[PDB]
Amino acid sequence: EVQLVESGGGLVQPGGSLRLSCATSGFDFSRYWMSWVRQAPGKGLVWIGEVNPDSTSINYTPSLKDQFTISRDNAKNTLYLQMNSLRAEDTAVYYCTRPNYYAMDYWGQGTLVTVSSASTKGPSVFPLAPSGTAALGCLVKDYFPEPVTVSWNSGALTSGVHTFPAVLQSSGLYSLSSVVTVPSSSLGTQTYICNVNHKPSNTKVDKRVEP
Amino acid sequence: DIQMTQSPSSLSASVGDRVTITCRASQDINNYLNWYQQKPGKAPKLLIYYTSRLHSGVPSRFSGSGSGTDFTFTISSLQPEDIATYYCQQGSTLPFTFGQGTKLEIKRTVAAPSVFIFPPSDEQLKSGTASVVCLLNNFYPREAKVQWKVDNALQSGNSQESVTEQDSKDSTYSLSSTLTLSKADYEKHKVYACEVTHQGLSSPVTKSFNRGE
Numbered sequence: 001e002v003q004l005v006e007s008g009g010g011l012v013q014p015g016g017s018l019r020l021s022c023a024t025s026g027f028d029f030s031r032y033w034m035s036w037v038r039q040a041p042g043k044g045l046v047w048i049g050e051v052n053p054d055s056t057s058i059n060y061t062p063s064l065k066d067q068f069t070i071s072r073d074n075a076k077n078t079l080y081l082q083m084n085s086l087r088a089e090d091t092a093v094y095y096c097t098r099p100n101y102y103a104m105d106y107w108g109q110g111t112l113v114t115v116s117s118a119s120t121k122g123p124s125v126f127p128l129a130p131s132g133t134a135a136l137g138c139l140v141k142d143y144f145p146e147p148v149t150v151s152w153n154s155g156a157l158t159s160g161v162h163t164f165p166a167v168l169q170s171s172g173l174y175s176l177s178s179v180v181t182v183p184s185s186s187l188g189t190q191t192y193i194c195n196v197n198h199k200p201s202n203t204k205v206d207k208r209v210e211p
Numbered sequence: 212d213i214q215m216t217q218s219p220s221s222l223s224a225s226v227g228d229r230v231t232i233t234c235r236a237s238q239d240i241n242n243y244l245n246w247y248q249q250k251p252g253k254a255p256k257l258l259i260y261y262t263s264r265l266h267s268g269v270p271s272r273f274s275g276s277g278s279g280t281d282f283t284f285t286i287s288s289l290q291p292e293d294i295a296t297y298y299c300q301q302g303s304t305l306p307f308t309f310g311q312g313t314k315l316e317i318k319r320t321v322a323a324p325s326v327f328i329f330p331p332s333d334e335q336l337k338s339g340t341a342s343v344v345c346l347l348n349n350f351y352p353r354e355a356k357v358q359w360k361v362d363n364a365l366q367s368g369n370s371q372e373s374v375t376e377q378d379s380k381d382s383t384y385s386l387s388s389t390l391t392l393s394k395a396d397y398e399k400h401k402v403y404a405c406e407v408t409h410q411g412l413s414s415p416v417t418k419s420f421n422r423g424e
């Protein structure tokens with residue numbers, strides 16, 4: 001099936017530049033127009049622009065034409081977004097999308113770009129251990145910028161999982177917890193590992209959680 | 212640029228309800244109107260295109276109507292998996308523009324939380340910090356009170372709460388309350404407890420542990 005995977009999101013200083021990439025699979029990329037859409041945290045969707053297959057037509061929303069340059073590499077089935085001199089108002093999740101029919105039928109999961117004068121910091125990962133139903137988890141502490149992704153048992157465990165929205169601590173660093181409820185009889189039996197990924201700092205941590 | 216306005220901006224409805232959302236365009240866009248659904252923590256998904264055409268694999272309960280400047284999106288019978296923010300999008304003139312979204316929430320019966328307490332790990336303690344976590348799992352309504360008790364006495368420390376969005380299967384919420392203390396302060400007390408008050412609980416529920424046990 002059609003797959004759209006964005007990468008490159010992280011911390012950008014105000015006035016800074018960054019290039020995003022959208023790697024595709026499951027379709028002949030060279031035959032399709034491609035687009036970018038953004039969404040500021042807790043806000044609406046904003047169309048950035050589109051590129052036709054041979055790159056002869058590139059259209060942008062007028063208010064953002066200075067901040068963005070759209071390009072593509074048909075040989076690599078990759079869409080790019082060159083971000084220029086970003087502002088605090090440009091903090092958003094950036095989605096690559098595929099137009100079809102004037103509708104966008106496929107969307108990537110998006111990549112978050114944070115525009116801030118602070119510094120990047122990887123998280124510390126700690127177990128939340130239990131002692132009919134039991135709960136366990138992982139505490140993902142002191143990171144910047146957002147986001148962190150958490151999976152359980154490399155994605156084999158999904159039912160009963162709750163990954164909480166991050167909280168901004170007094171230190172200006174983020175923290176979140178990911179929890180899962182399981183049968184209590186499985187505590188001695190099954191292995192539980194949370195897989196934490198913080199792409200902005202290239203931090204990957206696998207933490208075994210034992211009672 | 213064509214301005215797209217949605218109404219209501221937010222609504223609560225019950226499973227089984229017919230739900231109708233409107234979209235109005237600043238100028239005539241003929242029938243070039245699309246609807247997207249965005250589930251919590253997920254990317255938008257195309258539901259309806261060209262005002263009334265269902266996209267491939269979209270449930271028959273979703274429909275669209277209108278023309279010119281006024282459009283309607285209807286869910287014939289609301290399902291728990293329909294919890295989302297819905298957006299309209301005009302495709303008549305460049306730049307393509309979206310409505311501000313309609314956040315659809317679900318009203319359901321009271322569900323009491325299941326409560327769990329977690330001590331700080333020995334790994335975190337070695338670093339100089341102690342975070343104590345109280346989990347309130349799968350409850351409804353969103354309103355809940357969590358109180359930290361240290362040695363059966365009320366503690367007025369640094370505690371922060373986080374709440375999930377409504378679950379797509381049972382429309383419940385979960386909440387975490389995290390008490391952060393320095394290792395030195397964590398060691399000034401023995402019993403750590405979190406006391407929970409919620410509409411589904413006839414009397415408050417306490418979960419506790421003894422430091423070192």
Ligand code: NA
Pocket residue numbers: 291292379380381
């Ligand atoms: Na359900």
